[PDB]
Design a protein around this motif. Structure first.
Motif, PDB file in Angstrom:
ATOM      1  N   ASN A   1      87.215  46.289  22.021  1.00 59.89           N
ATOM      2  CA  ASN A   1      86.972  47.679  21.648  1.00 59.89           C
ATOM      3  C   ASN A   1      85.766  48.249  22.380  1.00 59.89           C
ATOM      4  O   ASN A   1      85.777  49.416  22.781  1.00 59.89           O
ATOM      5  N   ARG A   2      84.720  47.447  22.575  1.00 61.86           N
ATOM      6  CA  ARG A   2      83.572  47.971  23.313  1.00 61.86           C
ATOM      7  C   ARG A   2      83.829  48.019  24.811  1.00 61.86           C
ATOM      8  O   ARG A   2      83.493  49.004  25.469  1.00 61.86           O
ATOM      9  N   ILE A   3      84.416  46.966  25.369  1.00 59.37           N
ATOM     10  CA  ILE A   3      84.694  46.865  26.794  1.00 59.37           C
ATOM     11  C   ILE A   3      86.199  46.731  26.946  1.00 59.37           C
ATOM     12  O   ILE A   3      86.775  45.755  26.464  1.00 59.37           O
ATOM     13  N   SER A   4      86.816  47.681  27.657  1.00 61.94           N
ATOM     14  CA  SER A   4      88.248  47.971  27.575  1.00 61.94           C
ATOM     15  C   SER A   4      89.119  46.772  27.957  1.00 61.94           C
ATOM     16  O   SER A   4      88.665  45.818  28.594  1.00 61.94           O
TER      17      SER A   4
ATOM     18  N   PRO B   1      73.953  43.517  21.668  1.00 61.54           N
ATOM     19  CA  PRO B   1      73.888  43.969  20.267  1.00 61.54           C
ATOM     20  C   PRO B   1      75.108  43.597  19.444  1.00 61.54           C
ATOM     21  O   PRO B   1      74.967  43.218  18.278  1.00 61.54           O
ATOM     22  N   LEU B   2      76.308  43.678  20.027  1.00 61.29           N
ATOM     23  CA  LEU B   2      77.519  43.317  19.299  1.00 61.29           C
ATOM     24  C   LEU B   2      77.584  41.816  19.057  1.00 61.29           C
ATOM     25  O   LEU B   2      78.018  41.366  17.990  1.00 61.29           O
ATOM     26  N   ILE B   3      77.144  41.028  20.040  1.00 69.52           N
ATOM     27  CA  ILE B   3      77.048  39.580  19.887  1.00 69.52           C
ATOM     28  C   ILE B   3      76.001  39.226  18.848  1.00 69.52           C
ATOM     29  O   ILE B   3      76.214  38.343  18.008  1.00 69.52           O
ATOM     30  N   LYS B   4      74.872  39.927  18.855  1.00 66.25           N
ATOM     31  CA  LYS B   4      73.818  39.662  17.883  1.00 66.25           C
ATOM     32  C   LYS B   4      74.243  40.040  16.471  1.00 66.25           C
ATOM     33  O   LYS B   4      73.818  39.399  15.507  1.00 66.25           O
ATOM     34  N   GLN B   5      75.084  41.059  16.324  1.00 68.02           N
ATOM     35  CA  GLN B   5      75.468  41.467  14.980  1.00 68.02           C
ATOM     36  C   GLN B   5      76.607  40.625  14.425  1.00 68.02           C
ATOM     37  O   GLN B   5      76.523  40.128  13.305  1.00 68.02           O
ATOM     38  N   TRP B   6      77.686  40.459  15.187  1.00 65.86           N
ATOM     39  CA  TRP B   6      78.877  39.867  14.601  1.00 65.86           C
ATOM     40  C   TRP B   6      79.048  38.389  14.903  1.00 65.86           C
ATOM     41  O   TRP B   6      79.904  37.751  14.286  1.00 65.86           O
ATOM     42  N   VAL B   7      78.261  37.820  15.803  1.00 71.57           N
ATOM     43  CA  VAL B   7      78.396  36.402  16.079  1.00 71.57           C
ATOM     44  C   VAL B   7      77.219  35.662  15.456  1.00 71.57           C
ATOM     45  O   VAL B   7      77.402  34.878  14.523  1.00 71.57           O
ATOM     46  N   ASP B   8      75.998  35.968  15.892  1.00 69.45           N
ATOM     47  CA  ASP B   8      74.815  35.223  15.479  1.00 69.45           C
ATOM     48  C   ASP B   8      74.366  35.456  14.034  1.00 69.45           C
ATOM     49  O   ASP B   8      73.414  34.804  13.610  1.00 69.45           O
ATOM     50  N   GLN B   9      75.006  36.340  13.260  1.00 71.96           N
ATOM     51  CA  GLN B   9      74.376  36.784  12.027  1.00 71.96           C
ATOM     52  C   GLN B   9      75.130  36.467  10.741  1.00 71.96           C
ATOM     53  O   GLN B   9      74.490  36.478   9.682  1.00 71.96           O
ATOM     54  N   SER B  10      76.439  36.218  10.799  1.00 75.13           N
ATOM     55  CA  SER B  10      77.242  35.688   9.680  1.00 75.13           C
ATOM     56  C   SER B  10      77.250  36.603   8.452  1.00 75.13           C
ATOM     57  O   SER B  10      76.707  36.276   7.397  1.00 75.13           O
TER      58      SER B  10
ATOM     59  N   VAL C   1      73.951  49.260  11.215  1.00 75.18           N
ATOM     60  CA  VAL C   1      73.124  50.383  11.653  1.00 75.18           C
ATOM     61  C   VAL C   1      73.694  51.073  12.880  1.00 75.18           C
ATOM     62  O   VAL C   1      73.063  51.972  13.437  1.00 75.18           O
ATOM     63  N   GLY C   2      74.889  50.685  13.306  1.00 75.13           N
ATOM     64  CA  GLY C   2      75.473  51.251  14.499  1.00 75.13           C
ATOM     65  C   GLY C   2      76.123  52.597  14.267  1.00 75.13           C
ATOM     66  O   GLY C   2      75.831  53.292  13.293  1.00 75.13           O
ATOM     67  N   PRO C   3      76.997  53.008  15.180  1.00 72.23           N
ATOM     68  CA  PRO C   3      77.833  54.188  14.942  1.00 72.23           C
ATOM     69  C   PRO C   3      79.098  53.834  14.180  1.00 72.23           C
ATOM     70  O   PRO C   3      79.523  52.679  14.114  1.00 72.23           O
ATOM     71  N   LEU C   4      79.709  54.863  13.600  1.00 68.53           N
ATOM     72  CA  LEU C   4      80.851  54.696  12.712  1.00 68.53           C
ATOM     73  C   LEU C   4      81.818  55.845  12.924  1.00 68.53           C
ATOM     74  O   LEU C   4      81.431  57.006  12.817  1.00 68.53           O
ATOM     75  N   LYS C   5      83.068  55.535  13.225  1.00 69.41           N
ATOM     76  CA  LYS C   5      84.073  56.566  13.426  1.00 69.41           C
ATOM     77  C   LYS C   5      84.687  56.950  12.090  1.00 69.41           C
ATOM     78  O   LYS C   5      84.904  56.099  11.228  1.00 69.41           O
ATOM     79  N   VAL C   6      84.938  58.241  11.906  1.00 66.21           N
ATOM     80  CA  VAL C   6      85.638  58.749  10.739  1.00 66.21           C
ATOM     81  C   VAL C   6      86.673  59.762  11.218  1.00 66.21           C
ATOM     82  O   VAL C   6      86.420  60.534  12.144  1.00 66.21           O
ATOM     83  N   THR C   7      87.871  59.710  10.654  1.00 65.24           N
ATOM     84  CA  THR C   7      88.959  60.584  11.053  1.00 65.24           C
ATOM     85  C   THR C   7      89.318  61.486   9.886  1.00 65.24           C
ATOM     86  O   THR C   7      89.713  61.000   8.827  1.00 65.24           O
ATOM     87  N   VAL C   8      89.189  62.798  10.082  1.00 72.58           N
ATOM     88  CA  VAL C   8      89.488  63.778   9.053  1.00 72.58           C
ATOM     89  C   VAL C   8      90.729  64.548   9.467  1.00 72.58           C
ATOM     90  O   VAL C   8      90.777  65.128  10.557  1.00 72.58           O
ATOM     91  N   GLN C   9      91.740  64.537   8.608  1.00 71.24           N
ATOM     92  CA  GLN C   9      92.933  65.343   8.774  1.00 71.24           C
ATOM     93  C   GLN C   9      92.762  66.605   7.945  1.00 71.24           C
ATOM     94  O   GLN C   9      92.776  66.545   6.706  1.00 71.24           O
TER      95      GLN C   9
END
Lengths: 963, 25
Positions: free
Chosen positions: A437-440, A492-501, A536-544
């Motif tokens: 998702n971060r790198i296509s 940052p993505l490695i530090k958040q979702w891999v190293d941090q549990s 603490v990152g960004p967050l997508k929200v979809t409004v219909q």
């Protein structure tokens, strides 16, 4: 850069096996290793060996002295009075680390003779010739010898190498690490009527001078580890693939047509994995072996895969095609990225498991559609968030304890719990989806192609590992290759979702400001739960809204709570125009339920599942109904079904009924809407107008036009109304009346579905539909009204339950004469008899399930009967049934059944640590401590299951019910 | 035995052969 923990480098290994005796369950052989010392004064060489009796060891044809000791045989001493689990976990981690080949250690310590010290100081080659013998192996390599008379090929006796991770030490002495790559020469002298399948390519097959035995010679020039070397010796029926000609399929005798039909898809899996990656298949052959009493359902070795025969189906078997198809697919994904590119440490295992699971998910996307891909990704994410909120968290890439919130050590694969291993692989492939998702995705496939291309330039050199370590991936090398191909780093993505549990929890609620036309979201995180972490990152929200679907990115810093996003017009309510959707289409919506002042129809927080999250959004019920009806995303339809159970209004019943009637909805959404409609119908009793839920809909969809109560004859060629037809009475049987008794209108409907079933006309089998009919009959059973603990006889048999009992008796007896597939109806009828025993209908007697749990039955019948016995010994507090189950754990021939009994006794424990039970003796504590210490010393999966059982029953401290 | 008789559960040797294999094909 890879530097070995061993002071020697292994170049070549010869494994020769003679005298495979099936009567005595014994092999004899030798092993000849070719090591180059890297440090002078090598003196001792430490190899890995379990269960092998080492006869003699000669180094450079000179007799050498060895000493063998295995500290993992009895982990703690017998005369230590410790009974807490933290002591055993530390001692077990230290014992496994003392035999670890990933350190310098090993179990067999061979002393270099004195006259070779001038040969070892100036670093020259050493050829170590060990000859060994397995006398009667416990879990090393499995001997399946049936008790029919005849020759061993005439009765169907076979051997295969079982185990997980580094378990090749269990059948020959080796350096059993994934980092010691060498080339291989494998000779197996088997009977003349048998075939020996192994890794490499078969260079020849010579006869013996009596022509009663023949020797299979295999050679493996691609340098693999010892842990990827396997073996399957048996009277296999050989089938060359008619599409790809280096692929041979081996099955057990009399199962050749099932093998022909089952393995006919595999060339498309090969073509997919070779066109998304651009490397061809690295090995020169591929061999699929189908065996009996398998360890796991699918094991993948170098140039070889070992599946169980229970995956083999015929052309008329549906509901098993997709499962066998995806087992073949994940075995091939592990062929690419678990066996060719190997691991550098025990850390960096998340890289390989993530790449395997990620490319298998890409295969599932292309094969079964994006909707099945989204449903699979959502079920894996729900699995992880349930496990991580249940107990601590899964830590990909630990640093060496790093995770002290659990009861085992994560330093070695053989100390992990099996549920932790499963959730480890699951989280690894979801984190790889996040990196995509971060790198296509095209850059991701370029990363994988670069790894494979480095490995395949490495795989053809002859230098003994000057270049063979480019076939080993690490975390730093993987991140460096990502940074090479993309220019972005993911640290940052490695530090958040891999190293941090941890996973994150989102609680959202909105409010529409009519004055300034804005939407004020309120997103707060629960970061104080034991499994959670702070995002603490960004967050997508979809409004219909009425003007269409708009995406917004929110920056959710620590102090953030209110996020004001802007809203568009409401001019599509002034004129009737179509409201445009998330895709390019537009639909007519009934806007009578919508608020007059707000344009927004629904809101979805993190729609693309771009974080490892659990969302709890507070919409209004009409917004959930609009999201169920008009959304073009299956995960949003599923979450709206899941959130409509709290709103039992008749508009939600209309929404779920319109979903159920609607073809061109994804079928797994309608299968969920059945159960949601059943729950809503149970909650609005004394308001429900007409017939029971889904009955009129069943007669409209699946019955005759002229006869409403006669079902149509079975034609299962649509595969979506087949699944919906077999899932709708199972949900319809959960219909609960005001008196708490199932309506005799639904039970009679299910019994008429059973009577009028005609399957003489479709090209598919009926075993799963009939098994689901038995499951629907079992769902209707309400607890009986016993008076004064009256003994359950025929005098007090419910008039409803007598019909159910007659039907399951007829079905089980007809299964005894005409069986089906998977013995599904035996499993369903045993499950239904346990349902009738759980309520006060049938006497609570485990003798039937104890007769179905014997050795000679099919393994599905065995695990269903053992599940019934585990449930009985939980409810009736039976001491002798628990001793029966523990004895069956200790001495059963099939190790998968032992692992499954420990698993079921962990999931449904006879008592927990909080309960006072009669079964909390010092005798049971001593039995389970002896089962952790000794007894399970031969499997590495029974020992972790015994650790899990001791943790579930007695906890991390000292067993309380003890002096 | 007169009312609701059950055929007793008999052990086989290879249970997957009687489970997984189709009988009408």
């Amino acid at each position: 850069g890879f530097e070995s923990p061993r002071p020697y480098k292994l170049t070549h290994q010869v494994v020769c096996i003679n005298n495979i005796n099936f009567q005595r369950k014994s092999v004899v052989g030798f092993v000849e290793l070719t090591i180059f010392p890297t440090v002078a004064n090598l003196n001792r060489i430490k190899l890995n060996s379990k269960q092998c009796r080492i006869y003699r060891v000669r180094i450079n044809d000179l007799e050498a002295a060895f000493i063998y000791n295995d500290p993992t045989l009895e982990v703690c001493h017998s005369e230590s009075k410790q009974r807490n689990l933290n002591y055993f976990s530390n001692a077990y981690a230290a014992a496994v680390s003392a035999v670890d080949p990933d350190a310098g250690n090993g179990e067999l310590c061979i002393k270099v003779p004195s006259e070779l010290w001038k040969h070892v100081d100036e670093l020259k080659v050493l050829k170590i010739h060990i000859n060994f013998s397995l006398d009667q192996p416990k879990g090393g390599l499995h001997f399946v010898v049936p008790s029919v008379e005849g020759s061993m090929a005439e009765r169907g006796a076979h051997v295969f190498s079982c185990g997980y991770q580094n378990s090749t030490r269990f059948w020959f002495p080796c350096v059993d690490s994934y980092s010691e790559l060498c080339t291989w020469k494998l000779e197996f002298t088997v009977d003349a009527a048998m075939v020996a399948v192994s890794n490499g390519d078969l260079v020849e097959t010579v006869y013996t001078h009596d022509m009663r035995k023949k020797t299979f010679h295999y050679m493996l020039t691609i340098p693999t580890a010892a842990s990827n070397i396997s073996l399957a010796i048996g009277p296999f029926e050989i089938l060359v693939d008619p599409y790809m000609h280096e692929v041979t399929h081996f099955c057990l005798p009399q199962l050749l047509p099932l093998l022909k039909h089952t393995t006919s898809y595999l060339h498309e899996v090969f073509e997919f994995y070779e066109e998304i990656l651009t490397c061809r298949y690295p090995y020169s052959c591929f061999k699929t072996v189908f065996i009996d009493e398998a360890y796991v359902e699918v094991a993948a070795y170098a140039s070889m895969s070992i599946f169980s025969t229970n995956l083999l189906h015929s052309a008329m078997i549906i509901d098993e095609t997709p499962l066998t198809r995806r087992c073949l697919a994940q075995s091939l994904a592990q062929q690419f990225f678990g066996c060719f590119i190997s691991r550098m440490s025990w850390s960096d295992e998340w890289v390989l498991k993530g790449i395997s699971g990620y490319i298998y998910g890409l295969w599932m996307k292309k094969t079964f559609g994006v909707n099945e891909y989204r449903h699979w990704i959502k079920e894996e994410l729900d699995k992880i968030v349930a496990y991580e909120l249940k107990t601590g968290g899964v830590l990909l890439h630990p640093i060496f304890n790093p995770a002290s919130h659990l009861h085992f050590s994560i330093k070695h694969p053989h100390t992990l719990s099996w549920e932790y291993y499963s959730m480890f692989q699951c989280k690894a492939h979801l984190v790889m989806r996040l990196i995509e998702n971060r790198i296509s995705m095209e850059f991701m496939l370029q990363v994988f192609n670069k790894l494979l291309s480095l490995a395949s330039t490495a795989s053809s050199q002859k230098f003994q590992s000057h270049m063979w370590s480019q076939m080993l991936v690490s975390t730093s090398g993987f991140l460096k290759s990502i940074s090479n191909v993309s220019g972005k780093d993911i640290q940052p993505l490695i530090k958040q979702w891999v190293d941090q549990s941890g996973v994150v929890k989102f609680y959202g609620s909105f409010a529409f400001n009519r004055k300034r036309n804005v939407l004020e979201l309120e997103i707060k995180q629960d970061y104080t739960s034991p499994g959670t972490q702070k995002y603490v990152g960004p967050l997508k929200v979809t409004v219909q809204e009425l003007d269409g679907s708009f995406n917004h990115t929110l920056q959710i810093e620590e102090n953030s709570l209110k996020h004001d996003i802007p809203c568009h017009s409401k001019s599509r309510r002034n004129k009737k125009k179509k409201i445009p959707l998330m895709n390019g289409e537009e639909v007519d919506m009934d806007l009578s339920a919508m608020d007059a002042d707000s344009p927004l129809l629904w809101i979805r927080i993190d729609p693309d599942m771009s974080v490892l999250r659990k969302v709890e959004f507070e919409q209004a019920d009409f917004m959930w109904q609009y999201q169920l009806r008009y959304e073009r995303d299956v995960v949003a339809q599923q979450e709206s079904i899941l959130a409509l159970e709290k709103f039992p209004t008749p508009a939600s019943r209309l929404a779920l009924t319109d979903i159920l009637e609607q073809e061109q909805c994804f079928y797994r959404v309608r299968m969920s809407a059945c159960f949601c409609l059943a729950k809503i119908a149970n909650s609005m009793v004394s308001t429900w107008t007409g017939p029971p839920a889904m009955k009129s809909l069943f007669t409209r969809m699946f019955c005759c036009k002229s006869c409403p109560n006669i079902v149509k004859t079975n034609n299962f060629m649509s595969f979506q109304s087949y699944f919906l037809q077999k899932t709708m009475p199972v949900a319809m049987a959960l219909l609960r009346d005001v008196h708490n008794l199932c309506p005799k209108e639904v039970l009679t409907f299910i019994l008429d579905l059973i009577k009028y079933n005609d399957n003489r006309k479709n090209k598919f089998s009926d075993n799963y539909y009939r098994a689901e009919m038995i499951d629907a009959l079992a769902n209707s059973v309400t607890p009986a009204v016993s008076v004064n603990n009256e003994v359950r006889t025929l005098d007090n048999l419910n008039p409803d339950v007598r019909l159910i009992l007659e039907e399951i008796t007829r079905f089980l007896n007809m299964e005894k004469l005409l069986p089906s597939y998977r013995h599904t109806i035996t499993v369903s009828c045993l499950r239904a008899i346990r349902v009738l025993q759980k309520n006060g209908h049938v006497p609570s007697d485990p003798a039937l399930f104890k007769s179905y749990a014997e050795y000679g039955h099919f393994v599905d019948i065995r695990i269903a009967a053992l599940e019934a016995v585990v449930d009985y010994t939980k409810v009736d507090r039976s001491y002798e049934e628990l001793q029966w189950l523990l004895n069956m754990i200790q001495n059963d021939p099939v190790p998968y059944v032992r692992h499954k009994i420990l698993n079921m006794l962990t999931k449904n424990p006879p008592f927990t640590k909080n309960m006072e039970s009669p079964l909390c003796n010092e005798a049971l504590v001593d039995q389970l401590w002896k089962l952790m210490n000794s007894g399970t010393s031969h499997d590495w999966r029974l020992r972790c299951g015994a650790v899990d059982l001791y943790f579930t029953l007695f906890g991390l401290s000292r067993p309380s019910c003890l002096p | 035995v007169s009312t609701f008789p059950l055929i007793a559960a008999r052990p086989f040797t290879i249970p997957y052969l009687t489970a997984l294999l189709p009988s009408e094909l």
